[PDB]
Design a protein around this ligand. Structure first.
Ligand SMILES: Cc1cc(O)ccc1O
Ligand SMILES: Cc1cc(O)ccc1O
Ligand SMILES: Cc1cc(O)ccc1O
Ligand SMILES: Cc1cc(O)ccc1O
Ligand SMILES: Cc1cc(O)ccc1O
Ligand SMILES: Cc1cc(O)ccc1O
Ligand code: NA
Ligand code: NA
Lengths: 202, 202
């Protein structure tokens, strides 16, 4: 009756919207598309509270009978407001410089899945937010410097609301679909074959 | 030496409204601010469990503990909305329980570790989409996927330019957004915020 899909914060939830009407005709399933951050997504899969997870490769979640499949590559870019002082700096990535300016991070579950944004060191000003929306607005308001998935800020860079601080730092991340094998129902199986079709060419 | 204050802004409350604090707080003390989003009961659970210094959330009509002091910030207007071409608009009595079951609700998952709430009426045998963030709920509504309440400020532009349409004014409700905190703990940064945040919504 109920399927839960977990789309990690980096993954746009509305990309999964086409499924909804199809899923309602396919089964009497009430859908939940739930957002989690980093380790939270895999914690949900371990605790049997999430049927399918769409999340970056994050080192753990290792359980009994867990399968995966790669969907697409996502580009993360270090960004900041155009008139943020970091842009006038000669060596923005120098440890001496980075500590001066405030990092922006998104909260997650109590680890269990060893990864960091690798965007902020210690003894350095930090703002923590729960959602990518808060993070984008904080960046737009010139309140700090942080990574962002390129698609969500492509328009912002185009119209000069944000500016990439240094392209060398930009990194690529695999977005993967994972699930557990021990239970494999009609709706869950159907989605497992349908979700990759959403990102053919991504 | 630095200092860490954690503020919870419930989903209905715009996190960027609290941005003015950040630069002031950094010059006032070495205080690192953390502005976390929770949903419904989740915000209050955080205050009870001593994991949140200040809570900005709707009045949840729960026995106001002595240990929680609260102060009203502003009134928020919630509007029952749907896409302009959603069938609900042609319906004579949209709010009738018989009618509401026909159409799909859109709900935001209560972040409570203890129990969720019946906020969305939890109409049984009724199609539902559940999402974690108010943005995803907005997009679901924009895509004409169902019917749900929304805080007017977030959708004001959408109603103006006819991307969303108020289904029935009778359903419109006003909610008090309140600031709550605990008496057992006080310090420089906490006290400073408690006096500064109300000025943001004078
Ligand atoms: C728009 C958007 C794009 C994306 O690639 C990830 C998250 C988002 O919210
Ligand atoms: C809203 C949305 C943003 C996006 O980048 C891809 C698909 C979407 O539905
Ligand atoms: C690494 C990373 C994680 C995340 O949750 C959002 C953006 C990011 O760049
Ligand atoms: C922008 C915004 C305004 C608001 O009044 C509530 C939530 C929001 O995300
Ligand atoms: C940015 C912002 C949006 C809003 O809807 C209300 C207050 C605000 O400061
Ligand atoms: C109506 C409503 C109120 C709320 O506080 C959170 C989500 C909601 O859908
Ligand atoms: Na999302
Ligand atoms: Na928020």
């Amino acid at each position: 009756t109920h399927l839960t899909i977990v789309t990690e914060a980096l993954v746009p939830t509305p990309a999964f919207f086409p499924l909804i009407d199809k899923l309602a005709a396919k089964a009497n399933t009430q859908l939940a598309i739930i957002t989690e951050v980093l380790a939270g997504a895999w914690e949900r899969l371990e605790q049997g509270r999430a049927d399918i997870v769409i999340a970056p490769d994050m080192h753990f979640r290792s359980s009994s009978e867990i399968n995966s499949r790669k969907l697409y590559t996502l580009m993360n870019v270090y960004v900041a407001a155009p008139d943020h002082p970091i842009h006038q700096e000669p060596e923005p990535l120098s440890e001496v410089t980075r500590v001066k300016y405030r990092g922006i991070a998104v909260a997650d579950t109590a680890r269990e899945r060893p990864v960091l944004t690798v965007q902020l060191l210690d003894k350095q000003p930090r703002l923590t937010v729960s959602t990518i929306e808060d993070k984008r607005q904080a960046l737009l308001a010139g309140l700090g410097v942080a990574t962002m998935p390129y698609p969500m800020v492509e328009k912002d860079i185009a119209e000069g609301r944000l500016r990439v601080v240094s392209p060398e730092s930009t990194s690529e991340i695999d977005i993967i679909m994972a699930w557990r094998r021990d239970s494999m129902g009609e709706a869950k199986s159907w989605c497992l074959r349908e979700i990759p079709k959403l990102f053919n060419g991504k």
